[PDB]
Amino acid sequence: GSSGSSGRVKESITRTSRAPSVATVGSICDLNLKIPEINSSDMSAHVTSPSGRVTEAEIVPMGKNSHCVRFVPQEMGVHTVSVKYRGQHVTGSPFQFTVGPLGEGG
Numbered sequence: 701g702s703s704g705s706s707g708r709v710k711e712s713i714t715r716t717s718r719a720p721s722v723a724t725v726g727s728i729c730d731l732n733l734k735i736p737e738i739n740s741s742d743m744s745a746h747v748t749s750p751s752g753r754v755t756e757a758e759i760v761p762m763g764k765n766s767h768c769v770r771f772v773p774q775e776m777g778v779h780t781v782s783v784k785y786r787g788q789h790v791t792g793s794p795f796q797f798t799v800g801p802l803g804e805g806g
Contacts, residue, residue: 717796723773725799731769733783735790743785745769748794750777757781773799 723729735743745757757771773779781795 719797723779723797723799725801726774727772727802728770729773731771731781731795733767733769733790735767736765738785740767743767743783745771746782747771747773748780748782749775750780751775754782773797775799 740759740761743759745759747755747757749755755771757769760768760770762768769781779797779799781793781797783790783793783795
């Protein structure tokens with residue numbers, strides 16, 4: 701029930717859930733992630749489907765502290781990226797984003 705602001709486990713945390721870019725469907729998408737010196741051989745990128753399927757993603761070599769993931773986020777629902785480093789979810793992980801088809805230009 702309700703608490704008197706004395707200190708109790710959380711129930712529902714309010715957030716934004718907004719992406720810095722738009723994700724498309726059936727097309728290569730470049731995902732930029734601010735990663736430190738950490739390398740890829742140590743990291744692991746895998747996209748999870750709302751059906752229970754797990755895929756693999758490639759981390760193209762950008763720079764010393766830069767990395768890019770190119771993959772085709774195509775599912776029947778919501779897409780969720782699982783980026784863990786040595787068995788630990790990084791900041792903003794897993795990453796959830798909604799996909800949509802490309803209609804007109806503008």
